[PDB]
Design an enzyme around this catalytic site. Sequence first.
Site, PDB file in Angstrom:
ATOM      1  CG  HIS A  68      -1.954  -1.278   0.962  1.00 16.63           C
ATOM      2  ND1 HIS A  68      -2.334  -2.315   1.461  1.00 16.63           N
ATOM      3  CD2 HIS A  68      -3.211  -0.864   0.183  1.00 16.63           C
ATOM      4  CE1 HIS A  68      -3.514  -2.462   1.050  1.00 16.63           C
ATOM      5  NE2 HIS A  68      -4.135  -1.969  -0.017  1.00 16.63           N
ATOM      6  CG  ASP A 107      -4.990   2.181  -0.754  1.00 21.01           C
ATOM      7  OD1 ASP A 107      -6.050   2.014   0.058  1.00 21.01           O
ATOM      8  OD2 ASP A 107      -4.105   1.609  -1.612  1.00 21.01           O
ATOM      9  CD  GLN A 269      -4.171 -14.770  -4.735  1.00 20.33           C
ATOM     10  OE1 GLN A 269      -3.904 -14.455  -5.850  1.00 20.33           O
ATOM     11  NE2 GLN A 269      -3.479 -14.077  -3.975  1.00 20.33           N
TER      12      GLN A 269
HETATM   13  C1  LIG Z   1      -4.912  -8.421  -5.212  1.00 19.32           C
HETATM   14  C2  LIG Z   1      -4.949  -9.631  -4.495  1.00 19.32           C
HETATM   15  C3  LIG Z   1      -4.491 -10.456  -4.100  1.00 19.32           C
HETATM   16  N1  LIG Z   1      -4.057 -11.305  -3.380  1.00 19.32           N
HETATM   17  C4  LIG Z   1      -4.742 -10.914  -2.535  1.00 19.32           C
HETATM   18  C5  LIG Z   1      -4.794 -12.458  -1.365  1.00 19.32           C
HETATM   19  S1  LIG Z   1      -5.952 -13.096  -1.416  1.00 19.32           S
HETATM   20  C6  LIG Z   1      -6.078 -14.696  -0.659  1.00 19.32           C
HETATM   21  N2  LIG Z   1      -7.046 -15.271   0.084  1.00 19.32           N
HETATM   22  C7  LIG Z   1      -7.052 -16.168   0.479  1.00 19.32           C
HETATM   23  C8  LIG Z   1      -8.087 -17.785   1.598  1.00 19.32           C
HETATM   24  C9  LIG Z   1      -7.394 -18.049   2.135  1.00 19.32           C
HETATM   25  C10 LIG Z   1      -5.583 -18.100   2.828  1.00 19.32           C
HETATM   26  N3  LIG Z   1      -4.521 -19.088   2.916  1.00 19.32           N
HETATM   27  C11 LIG Z   1      -3.611 -18.768   3.309  1.00 19.32           C
HETATM   28  S2  LIG Z   1      -3.159 -17.607   1.229  1.00 19.32           S
HETATM   29  C12 LIG Z   1      -4.942 -17.111   1.687  1.00 19.32           C
HETATM   30  C13 LIG Z   1      -5.798 -15.896   0.904  1.00 19.32           C
HETATM   31  N4  LIG Z   1      -5.446 -15.089  -0.027  1.00 19.32           N
HETATM   32  C14 LIG Z   1      -5.808  -9.980  -2.734  1.00 19.32           C
HETATM   33  C15 LIG Z   1      -5.473  -9.094  -2.860  1.00 19.32           C
HETATM   34  O1  LIG Z   1      -6.748  -8.065  -2.653  1.00 19.32           O
HETATM   35  C16 LIG Z   1      -6.192  -7.013  -1.171  1.00 19.32           C
HETATM   36  C17 LIG Z   1      -5.197  -6.175  -1.961  1.00 19.32           C
HETATM   37  C18 LIG Z   1      -7.665  -6.654  -1.555  1.00 19.32           C
HETATM   38 MG   LIG Z   2      -7.350   1.010   0.472  1.00 19.82          MG
HETATM   39 ZN   LIG Z   3      -5.421   0.647  -2.558  1.00 23.09          ZN
END
Ligand SMILES: Cc1cnc(CSc2nc3ccc4ncsc4c3[nH]2)cc1OC(C)C
Ligand SMILES: [Mg+2]
Ligand SMILES: [Zn+2]
Length: 313
Positions: A68, A107, A269
Site C-alpha cells: 500500500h 490509499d 488465490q
Molecule cells: C489483489 C490481491 C491479491 N491477492 C490477495 C490475497 S487473496 C487470498 N485469499 C485467501 C484465503 C485463504 C488463504 N490462506 C492462505 S493465503 C490465503 C488467501 N489469499 C488479495 C488481493 O486483494 C487485496 C489487496 C484487496
Molecule cells: Mg485501500
Molecule cells: Zn488500494
Amino acid sequence: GLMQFTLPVRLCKEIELFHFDIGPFENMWPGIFVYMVHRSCGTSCFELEKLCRFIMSVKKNYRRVPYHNWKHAVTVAHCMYAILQNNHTLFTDLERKGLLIACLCHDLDHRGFSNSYLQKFDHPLAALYSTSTMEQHHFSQTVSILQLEGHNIFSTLSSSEYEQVLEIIRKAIIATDLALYFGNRKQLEEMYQTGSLNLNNQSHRDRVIGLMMTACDLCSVTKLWPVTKLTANDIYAEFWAEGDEMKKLGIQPIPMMDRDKKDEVPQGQLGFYNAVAIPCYTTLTQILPPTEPLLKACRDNLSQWEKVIRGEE
Ligand SMILES: Cc1cnc(CSc2nc3ccc4ncsc4c3[nH]2)cc1OC(C)C
Ligand SMILES: [Mg+2]
Ligand SMILES: [Zn+2]
C-alpha cells in the site's frame, strides 16, 4: 502551456495497454501520472506548477509499506487511465479530472493494516470512523493536501463544480473499501440483467464508478503472470505482518494473514479470483465492453494459479 510530457517509445506505446507495468524507476512515476492527466483530461485541466506540487505532497504522505505504497497509487491511476481512454465519450470533464486524482489519493497514509486490525487494536481512527475506517482517512488526507498553499489543482473550477469533483473523489475512495464491493456489484448485476441500468441516473453512475475503482484497485490480477506473482509477494508481506500483530493481541489471524499457512496461498488465490476478481471484471465488461482485456488477463492469471496447485509451477 506548450510543455508536453513525452515518454520513451516503449512506454509511449505500452502505457495505453491495460497490463502496463510502470517499472522500477520511482523518479519517472510523477511524469507517467502527468502524461496520463494531459492525454486523459487535457494540458489545461490543471496548472502544471500546482499539479507537480500536489503529486509530490501525495507521494510524501504514502508510507514505506510493502504493498500500500506510492507505486500502488500510480499503478491504480494507470488502470483508471486505460479505462477512461477506452471509453472516451462515456465520462464528463469533471469525472476524468476527479477519478485520476481519486486513484492517486485512494490509499493516502496507509499503515499496511486492514480496517479489522485498527478495530481490534482499538486505533484512534476506528473511534473517528466506525466503517470504511482507512477509506475515510484516505479522503480526509486528500482534502488536507488540496488545502495546502499552492496545492489547489481545482482552483479554476466554480464553487458547484468544486463540490461536485470532491463528491466524485469521496465516493470513489470510499468505494475502494472491498467490504462495500460485494453489494455494489450485486446491485449492478441485477440492474444490467433486468435492463434498468441508466448512465444518466446519478445513483447508477456512482455504482459504475465504484466498480471501476474496485477494478483499478485489484488490477494486480490483470497484469502478465510474472508481475501478478511478484505483486502477490508484497501483498502477502503486509498481510503476514498484520497476522503477526493479531497474534501479539492474542487473536489467531485468518489463514490469509497467517504466515504459518503459506502452503494454502495457491488455493487462497483461486477463491479470491472466483469470489472477487472474475465477478468484478465480468460485471465491468458487461457495463463497459472495451474493458474486456482486464477480464481476459484475470482469467489467464486464474489459469496460472490452477497450474501452481497441479505442481506444473
Ligand atoms: C489483489 C490481491 C491479491 N491477492 C490477495 C490475497 S487473496 C487470498 N485469499 C485467501 C484465503 C485463504 C488463504 N490462506 C492462505 S493465503 C490465503 C488467501 N489469499 C488479495 C488481493 O486483494 C487485496 C489487496 C484487496
Ligand atoms: Mg485501500
Ligand atoms: Zn488500494
